[PDB]
Symmetry: C2
Subunit: 393 residues, 2 copies
Amino acid sequence: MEITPSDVIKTLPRQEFSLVFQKVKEMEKTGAHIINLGQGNPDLPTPPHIVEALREASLNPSFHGYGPFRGYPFLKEAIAAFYKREYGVTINPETEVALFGGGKAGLYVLTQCLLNPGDIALVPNPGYPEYLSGITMARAELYEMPLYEENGYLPDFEKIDPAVLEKAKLMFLNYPNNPTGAVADAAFYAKAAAFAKEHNIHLIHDFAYGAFEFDQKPASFLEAEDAKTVGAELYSFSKTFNMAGWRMAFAVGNEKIIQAVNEFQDHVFVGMFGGLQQAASAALSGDPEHTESLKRIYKERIDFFTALCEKELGWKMEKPKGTFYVWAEIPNTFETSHQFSDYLLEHAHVVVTPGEIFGSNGKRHVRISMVSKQEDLREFVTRIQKLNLPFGS
Amino acid sequence: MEITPSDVIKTLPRQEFSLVFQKVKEMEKTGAHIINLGQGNPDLPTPPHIVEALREASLNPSFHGYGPFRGYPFLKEAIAAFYKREYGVTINPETEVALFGGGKAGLYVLTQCLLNPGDIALVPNPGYPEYLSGITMARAELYEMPLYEENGYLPDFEKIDPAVLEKAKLMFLNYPNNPTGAVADAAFYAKAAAFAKEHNIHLIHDFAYGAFEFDQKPASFLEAEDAKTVGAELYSFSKTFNMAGWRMAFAVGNEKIIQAVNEFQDHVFVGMFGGLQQAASAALSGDPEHTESLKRIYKERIDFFTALCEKELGWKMEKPKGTFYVWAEIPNTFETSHQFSDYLLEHAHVVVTPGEIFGSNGKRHVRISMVSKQEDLREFVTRIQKLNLPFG
Ligand SMILES: Cc1ncc(COP(=O)(O)O)c(CN)c1O
């Protein structure tokens, strides 16, 4: 008779960017050729040694049937070996690792495990909009931590109203940062961990861009003293290895957090395809020069693109410290980012991400991703040049 | 410095299967060799054309990057074509199909999409124990529909208390049935759909064993006229195609249910690796010879096993109408099925599944999965024979 979705469905936050993606289709069907610098989809293929590890693994009939609920020990061991090689961090593979079907699933599981209806989650502004999903589906309340350029886009924890710290049960942090490009160090992480320890806040660090800091090796949150006491770090295969489509991620950290994850997941999953696990293990154990090479590709695109914007458009952009995103100020003749991104879409047929989809503190920037080939980057600039916008002002 | 799991975690129900598996692992740790007829874990390999489809697909760099949130259209189309071919049911691939990372995840998502705290979920007794997880996690309330042997293990909807039909938002049904092997027909599905329609209950049919009905051609719930009006059917690749480890499943049915699922999964569980999707497409469009051969193998195993048990133990068991499970009664000397299954594990080094985890109507039964070749099943019986039990 009448189909009735649950309240969790009715209250789901609107995916605001998806409306742009739809306008794109309606334009590309009218004849528009769109250059899309709005999304974080790696353009380059998964390295062939990873692909071949999947292809070989899939022939093993041991992976055809049900596997361990919590994943294969060989992958958890690869994860521990990886964290030691890359970050100098000691991880117990048997107690401190959990697997996820991508970071997005990990964020949902982690919030369901750590947030009660009515609890407060501390979330950065600007910040990855998907943080909102898990929090809303947990029926919890959001409290913003503003990231200002003056503070290097790191939150000031003493600015947080002490009135919320009792209800505050979870905090998100993300460095190297989407969308700002900013980076954090061991000292910041130590401070964060000290703060969470004092006010009993579970700390989830989103390390999706942990391979991509240009001036130095990125620090893991888990390098900080007391990080393992208060939190966990979410690591994705998506960006590091051009494995976005493969849907793999893991959490490393506090064994009590990991236990709660494992309990939840025992009710919903039976691990994941061992062919995928073996590919993940070949990714982690593989030559890190592949990832360094990938980092140099992004850095070249960043250098090429920002130099070209400045010369051709008079659009000066700060070079990011990490990630493949450029966080660019909009012309002061536009009031908001949605208005500027809409103007560029309509008049130049290009896509940038309006900064306000990351929160109110993004309203005067756009996010521009460097996951496109050189000539697409060039054609973006060529098209915008015709608009004659006052980027110089 | 105090980690505090959420109330969802604190109040999780017993993970009955996990607890059985754990006992089996502990026994194995002693160095004992075990014949494991517990979990319904297919012993035969994935058909090689499916494996080769994965291997070829993984070379395609389109699948290396993000794809469509709700799955590739080629797979949704293969699913519609499969449903037309096998069941004669018309499915709109653009609106009436959702993809899941396995039937177990599908159950979770469907309960989350359809139940509010305080709603009532109608569940069979006996029933798949994992129906309880999603219900409990949604903070919904459980109300049992007894499945009795004399009713053919079909529920009598007219015996449900009318008082609960107001708060009842969801009903699970499962034919061919885990654990009893019971089967259902078009008339029953029509009857259930009319009942759901009348009292506004969303109906989820679990069709995990839809390839394994031995006598009649298996009927989909969606063959019934009012079915797509009230509900949806959950189909797994695990049993049909020996794809248990691959974690792939789908729901087909009412477009509004499928919409709620999509909106949920958009935020959480986006489309799996496109390689897996192509493999799944090859599964569905593959010649149904392999499936029929698989069905024949399970049948021969059931025939063999039940006869041997009768001859050597005096353990009489009904042959199932479907699935690869046998549902068998425990001796009068045993208090509970847990005690009996523990006893066989400790003293015969064999695994069966204690019937109690399926509900109180399984209290005096065990489920045995025909998931090893005949000469393994013979050794299962030989081992139990040495215990001299009063199976009569
Ligand atoms: C009735 C029923 N439903 C759902 C499932 C879940 O199967 P999967 O997740 O492997 O698809 C199973 C297999 N245990 C089952 O027997």
